[PDB]
Design a protein around this ligand. Structure first.
Ligand SMILES: Cc1ncc(COP(=O)(O)O)c(CN)c1O
Ligand SMILES: Cc1ncc(COP(=O)(O)O)c(CN)c1O
Lengths: 399, 396
């Protein structure tokens, strides 16, 4: 009975959390700070802001950029709701763009056509750990510069559409040897229970090195937005009784605890071997399914080395009904599986805001025959062999 | 002596419970959060409880469940923490601040009446330091102004009046006329932040008192949906609304389950500390807010005191002198209109002079369950001497 995504937690993680629980710092403290430092080294970015979710990280990026009512934010039609929800939270207008025929990525021609005078941010999603075609994306925003008009402080520092990576799945992924985090202008990460790297709940915001961003000043802004808008002046912090503070904006509550950071520090030590195990599982699946009607998204390309978060596959010539039936047959054989994703316009939330599935047929076609197999580091080679064999047999029989 | 203001009280039992969660398959929201909700509902005498990642999340989702938004008004005291008021601006509603009484943190209820309009949807009283507000008076007020109210949402229709939502961040275990906090106001939000009496390092809850016109399961489902991206549901699920991410992990719940077992003895210790302070300061110019009244038995979260005849400058000086003697202290609170955030939205400190007068001479002493009776004795004695000296230097 093979589960889809159980957590891989050892005694080292437990010992580190216990150490936090014997200290005076059980919420944001020295270990969150240390995790930020070490994650910045790993993602090859100057500073990292650890928070309580990727959804928090993604939303604060937008709030730092002061994206708001009147502004537009392009998102793929094929993604998880959290990529798009944050756009509605800040009051901006989501603009969905349909995807390509071979891949989850946005059709970049349609992306170009979708850009307007109101466009402030593109949010590509590094689905399953596979990083998007960023050469193409930066080409597009440069080309469409002068549609852009800066209506905020940080928008002025860039003078173009800002690319913000939804890297929820992509910690440790690379694009042309560069780590995710260091490619897009801003990037958000998830450390949710079911991700490769986890703090049960948690996430981060980072940004690549850019001459027009003071990194300390940018970090201070995230911190302020994450901890109720609280600031202290230099006088108040020097004083022995440092009680006095101001609230500059009526902000949010999404800081990371040293409980979560503890988990993070140990996960990050163990992460390169967890990636290797994930690599070995994917390669064994790839052999197994070669020459079959089961077509996996490629986690190793000319440009990309994926984190290998999700084993997304599509079954050739399978209808919606036939897909649903395969998944149930997989479960009767004790193999959990999933679907990434219903395109956003199938969801009641986005229907209700006027998004219609017929404008994004490639997204629907991706969804129709998609099946995600288990990919985690508690799977054995025998379980992988069984999933391969069963999935091939169950698909044959249904067809 | 170097006495900290609010260190966390964490034992091996809490660590063993978290470790147990870390060996299970459920490291985020799982069976222990569910169990914590159940047990908290029994403790607060409410039917259902929603455990979340902060009181700020709990308070904000209450507002979003009630569909409080642009055009609506929410009354809050001028004397409170920013989190009481921030959530009002987050949903797009308009905050209405009301000044407080001369003797106490509570809103002046005459001014509260006058502040109510056709737009008013919610009053958020704050149970400051664990002291629960005058709810007989508050329900009298909303009932009196009942014709001003019109329900412009589903859950507003269940009440047909202004909804009272308790900011009980400090008040888990407090009671008003024998009733537990949680069971008095229409909705109540709790904080389990590191510095609170009951803690999960970060965490909180929303609950609501028993009301015939609220299906409790249906209300709970709505909170869950808003807390976990709008998801409802065997792969298939729908997202009904583009919602939020504020669920509680079984890591935090673990801490909660053990804290709740230990909580009645932590309250008793806090009771003993407060009583020793009360003796110490009797007949002095140090005037504590009362944690035991005719109506209230406080959780005893904060030992709020005001020093009679101390100016702003003299107060700031006392706090630093307290620190030179190794006694940490704090101020609850700057009135909201002193804060840059609320200044910028047009709130002006001169409309709330009682709130300012409360702030001016307020000093909060340490009240936590790592304090010894010797440390309490030293704080009593020092605070009396440091106040005497600061006033003598000023007269000179
Ligand atoms: C593609 C994508 N984007 C964003 C998120 C947000 O993750 P989190 O729960 O950490 O906010 C997730 C997972 N929830 C995801 O799968
Ligand atoms: C009076 C009051 N209200 C609300 C909050 C918000 O609590 P939390 O940090 O758990 O969101 C706080 C801070 N614990 C507070 O002191």
């Amino acid at each position: 009975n093979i589960p889809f995504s159980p957590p891989d937690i050892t005694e080292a993680e437990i010992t580190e959390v216990v150490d936090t629980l014997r200290s005076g710092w059980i919420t944001t403290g020295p270990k969150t700070k240390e995790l930020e430092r070490r994650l910045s080294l790993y993602t090859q970015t100057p500073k990292t802001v650890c928070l309580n979710s990727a959804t928090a990280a993604l939303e604060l990026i937008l709030r730092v950029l002061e994206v708001g009512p009147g502004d537009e934010v392009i998102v793929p039609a094929m993604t998880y709701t959290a990529s798009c929800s944050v756009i509605t939270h800040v009051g901006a207008t989501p603009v969905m763009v349909d995807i390509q025929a071979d891949t989850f990525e946005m059709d970049y021609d349609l992306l170009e056509q979708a850009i307007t005078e109101k466009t402030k941010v593109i949010i590509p999603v590094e689905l399953a750990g596979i990083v998007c075609d960023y050469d193409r994306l930066f080409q597009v925003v440069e080309k469409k510069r002068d549609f852009f008009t800066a209506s905020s402080k940080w928008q002025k520092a860039f003078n173009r559409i800002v690319i913000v990576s939804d890297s929820a799945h992509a910690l440790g992924s690379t694009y042309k040897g560069q780590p995710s985090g260091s490619i897009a202008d801003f990037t958000s990460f998830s450390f949710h229970a079911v991700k490769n790297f986890t703090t049960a709940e948690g996430g981060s915001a980072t940004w690549k090195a850019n001459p027009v961003i003071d990194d300390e000043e940018m970090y201070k802004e995230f911190q302020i937005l994450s901890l109720h808008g609280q600031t202290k002046d230099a006088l108040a912090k020097m004083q022995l009784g440092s009680w006095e503070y101001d609230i500059v904006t009526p902000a949010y509550k999404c800081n990371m605890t040293d409980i979560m950071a503890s988990l993070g520090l140990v996960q990050l030590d163990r992460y390169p071997s967890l990636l290797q195990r994930r690599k070995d599982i994917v390669d064994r699946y790839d052999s197994g399914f070669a020459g079959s009607r089961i077509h996996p998204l490629a986690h190793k390309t000319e440009t990309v080395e994926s984190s290998r978060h999700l084993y997304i596959t599509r079954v050739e010539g399978a209808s919606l009904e036939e897909r649903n039936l395969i998944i149930q047959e997989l479960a009767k054989a004790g193999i959990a599986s999933n679907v990434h994703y219903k395109p956003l316009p199938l969801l009641t939330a986005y229907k209700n805001l006027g998004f219609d599935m017929t404008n994004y047929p490639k997204a629907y076609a991706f969804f129709e025959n998609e099946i995600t197999l288990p990919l985690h580091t508690k799977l054995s080679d025998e379980e992988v062999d069984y999933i391969i064999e069963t999935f091939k047999t169950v698909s044959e029989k249904v067809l």
